[PDB]
Design a protein around this ligand. Structure first.
Ligand code: 6EC
Ligand code: 6EC
Ligand code: PLP
Ligand code: PLP
Ligand code: NA
Lengths: 315, 299
């Protein structure tokens, strides 16, 4: 029972993938290699971004940085914008998202529906300019505040305090944690928590390939490195092709009934490579991986529909 | 922790609608009239149909209709279609969806995504012909089985054993339950449970403007026009940050009437309403923004 939708977030299920796992059962050919999917679409707006959105706002509040009716300014499109829009609306704040004018429409659709306003910054300026614009705009008014998910430790804290502890509790035998590398909040926070608490644990990134746009799934330009990022937290980072990400996304729903967004496809590709390695090594693995959101908002890319080739060109 | 996604079904949040409720706090003007939203889009496939679909397969197993290597046939292409595809597959069965050849591509592509085999019946006869066709198909083989969601008591039981207990747990002060009237499983199952346990509880249906149905369960019944459903759906996302399907707008219309009525009478209310699915698949209609009349036309 929750007085507010804000509280109905986190404590997400960890689900075993009995069919997609390289080897679910221990046996004569060697120990189990299991995949466990953490379902972060079970959240207020359907993504993992509800965690850092809410914590960034509450931390801003505890720090005395917000006041009643304040306007939040964030250089984002996509899930974080949705998450902040919901949260801002429920706490009496306004939200303005800043994003490049050439940002994919699928990363925009629901924003005005949840109450947000959009500033469009110069397409050629890219990420760099959208961030600098939100930074400038925030300085116009004491009422206007930029949370900046790429550098706000409350992003990382949501995972250190939420995603991590839940994974420890549900999967004390964890050998690997795999997730997408975007703001880096999920891997930095969950990774730092698990590394402190689990002996020998590996932390593995998935990310897009350099040179592939996959625009409907990307918030930032290839070169940009979030200030949250700490290259010492990761054990490995793997680039995943669009064809492979889409293939795995279709595989997950077809085989395990879990309808996920495309980044989950990339994560699963990474987790399966990690898994094939343990299997060829004769080693036990229990690999937890993050389902960041559901496939719903990505249908209009055609990616779930026809051939893998067209899906690639659509991306 | 779950070995199977099927185990992550149910136990959905019940969430206060503080802004949208007629009166959240007991006031000087009288006692609170609260709205509480049961978020059934939190289920595995994103709708309430996960519950009856899983229970129907279990009951069919218990009844000795489903044995290893069986095939399930369902003549439906909506939320139950999806729930059954997900569940049949995880349970080890194949699923065939029998559907009119002119079913929207969106519906078909989603069933295929979840691994359903499709068999096309003729456009002419719509859903009736697809039902009749699945019956004929099932009769050809013992191992091939149709589950009858509209006539199947396991549907109702899933709410008597799931939705109901969960509601009473989270809202023991409940005065009204409000949901849509389709198969009638939700209202019949949940409503019978709540009536056996909560004295004076009201069970209220929302339904469109002009079997498991039991005439004795409902206390009230609201017919809702498209404009009202649509406008309530928008208000819910705009005001409460909950992005819900169109049937939720209808439910919300009924629940607000119920609420206003309690408010006028100065009675204390705790009204639980079902959010059966999310807005994703209704988004293309254009319903969530712009002209209400255009949303009505887009259906
Ligand atoms: O991090 C990602 N996407 C991502 C992460 C990892 C892998 C992939 C991927 C997608 C398609 C093919 C290959 C990789 C995509 N997106 C992202 C980053 C920051 C954000 O704020 C948001 C967002 O709010 O929507 C999304
Ligand atoms: O019954 C409904 N929807 C519903 C219920 C009550 C009211 C309304 C409604 C929607 C718009 C305007 C007015 C009423 C809609 N859906 C339903 C019923 C049976 C089903 O098998 C399915 C399904 O499988 O997708 C959906
Ligand atoms: C944010 C996000 C990621 C990346 O997560 P970070 O914690 O930002 O690194 C991956 N996939 C989806 C869908 C996201 O919304
Ligand atoms: C099934 C369904 C209903 C009606 O529920 P019943 O239990 O069939 O009466 C309402 N809304 C949506 C979205 C559904 O899928
Ligand atoms: Na048969």
């Amino acid at each position: 029972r929750y007085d507010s939708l804000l509280q109905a977030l986190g404590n997400t299920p960890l689900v075993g993938l009995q069919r997609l796992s390289p080897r679910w059962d221990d046996g004569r050919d060697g120990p189990h290699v299991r995949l466990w999917a953490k379902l972060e679409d079970r959240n207020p707006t359907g993504s993992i971004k509800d965690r850092p959105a809410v914590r960034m706002i509450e931390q801003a509040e505890a720090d005395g940085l917000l006041r009643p009716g304040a306007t939040i300014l964030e250089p984002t499109s996509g899930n974080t914008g949705i998450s902040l829009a919901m949260a801002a609306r429920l706490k009496g704040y306004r939200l303005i998202c800043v994003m490049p004018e050439n940002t994919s429409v699928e990363r925009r659709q629901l924003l005005e529906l949840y109450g947000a306003q959009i500033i469009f910054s110069a397409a050629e300026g890219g990420s760099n300019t959208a961030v600098a614009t939100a930074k400038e705009l925030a300085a116009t008014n004491p009422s206007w505040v930029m949370l900046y998910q790429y550098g706000n430790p409350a992003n990382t804290d949501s995972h250190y305090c939420g995603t991590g502890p839940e994974l420890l509790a549900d999967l004390p035998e964890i050998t690997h944690f795999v997730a997408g590398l975007g703001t880096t909040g999920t891997l930095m926070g969950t990774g730092r928590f698990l590394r402190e608490h689990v002996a020998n644990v590996k932390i593995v990134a998935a990310e897009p390939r350099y040179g592939e746009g996959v625009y409907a799934l990307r918030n930032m330009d290839e070169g940009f490195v979030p200030e949250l990022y700490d290259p010492e937290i990761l054990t490995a980072r793997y680039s995943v092709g669009a064809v492979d990400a889409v293939r795995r996304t279709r595989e997950l729903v077809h085989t395990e009934g879990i309808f996920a967004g495309i980044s989950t496809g990339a994560v699963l590709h990474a987790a399966l490579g990690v898994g094939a390695g343990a299997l060829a090594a004769g080693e036990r693995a229990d690999i937890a991986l993050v389902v960041a959101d559901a496939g719903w908002k990505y249908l209009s890319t055609g990616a779930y529909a026809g051939s893998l080739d067209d899906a690639e060109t659509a991306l």
